[PDB]
């Protein structure tokens, strides 16, 4: 009955025509450069996920490039960036693992200051304005640090009562990805001194796959383990805005750990799969 936790892809991309139109404007602005990197923002809607989708879509438009106050109620802002190559060869030859790894390290550095900031996304692109074809690849850095850490889990029915409280807490606290129980069983913001004692953590989940949490869970668990290095057993609530929230009795375990007091490494995944289900770029024609 005790399983090694596995995960689902955190997001699926949809880049609207207007995104590529706006990218085109951007590229024409920096035609003489090898590349540019620009910030993006998307507002995630976790209440209106298609019944047939497996996770939250990332719906990108021209407005994603801008600092709009266009957020609707309960939407979760997510920050990322687009790295656009002006030469297709550079796009092709970019070492994708090293690149996503570096994005993960930034999430990590943000995460240890604030667990709620250890999530982001990146788009790498090449815009062929001659053929009006756009190549892009979404990456969502999901990391396990140290790379040796895994989680043993088994179902925990008893915590079903907390789900609606978390659902509402998350709706209101739109900038938060994590909450925990305090000593009075009330939901509060993550605080390492408190969870160390109460050992109940809830995560805002972006997947809809039955009983399989989003790979972003690894980011949060990594920060948790850094903050509370001797935490072993705890309860993990996976909170969704549909009926599919679930709870796990969790235990940190390790495979092939590094010697204590070495610089812990990290394992990183999160490149989006394409139309054929391969780890490869997507292509769009305008």
């Amino acid at each position: 009955s005790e399983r090694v936790l596995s995960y689902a892809p955190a997001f699926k991309s949809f880049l609207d025509t207007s995104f590529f139109q706006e990218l085109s404007r951007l590229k024409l602005d920096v035609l003489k450069l090898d590349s540019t990197c620009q910030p993006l923002t998307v507002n995630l809607d976790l209440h209106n996920i298609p019944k047939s989708a497996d996770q939250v879509p990332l719906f990108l438009t021209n407005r994603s490039f801008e600092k709009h106050n266009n957020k609707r109620t309960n939407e979760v802002p997510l920050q990322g960036s687009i790295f656009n190559f002006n030469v297709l060869d550079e796009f092709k030859n970019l070492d994708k693992q090293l690149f996503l790894h570096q994005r993960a390290l930034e999430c990590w550095e943000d995460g240890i200051k604030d667990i709620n900031k250890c999530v982001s996304f990146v788009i790498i692109s090449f815009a062929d304005l001659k053929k009006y074809r756009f190549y892009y690849w979404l990456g969502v850095p999901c990391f396990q640090r140290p790379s040796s850490t895994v989680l043993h889990v088994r179902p925990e029915p008893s915590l079903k009562g907390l789900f609606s409280k978390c659902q509402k807490w998350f709706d209101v606290n739109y900038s938060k990805w994590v909450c925990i129980l305090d000593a009075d069983d009330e939901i509060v913001n993550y605080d390492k001194c408190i969870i160390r004692k109460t050992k109940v953590l809830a995560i805002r989940d972006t997947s809809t796959m039955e009983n399989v949490p989003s790979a972003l869970t690894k980011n949060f668990l990594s920060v948790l383990q850094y903050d509370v290095p001797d935490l072993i057993d705890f309860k993990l609530l996976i909170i969704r805005q549909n009926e599919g929230s679930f709870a796990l009795n969790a235990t940190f375990a390790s495979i092939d750990p590094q010697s204590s007091s070495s610089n812990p490494d990290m394992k990183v995944s999160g490149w989006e799969r394409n139309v054929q289900g391969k780890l490869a770029p997507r292509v769009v024609d305008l």
Binding site: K92, R133, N274, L279, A280
Partner: peptide, 12 residues
């Protein structure tokens, strides 16, 4: 050569 490019960029 779209199909060729995508194949060359596939990772593991």
């Amino acid at each position: 050569d779209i199909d060729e490019l995508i194949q060359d960029m596939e990772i593991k």
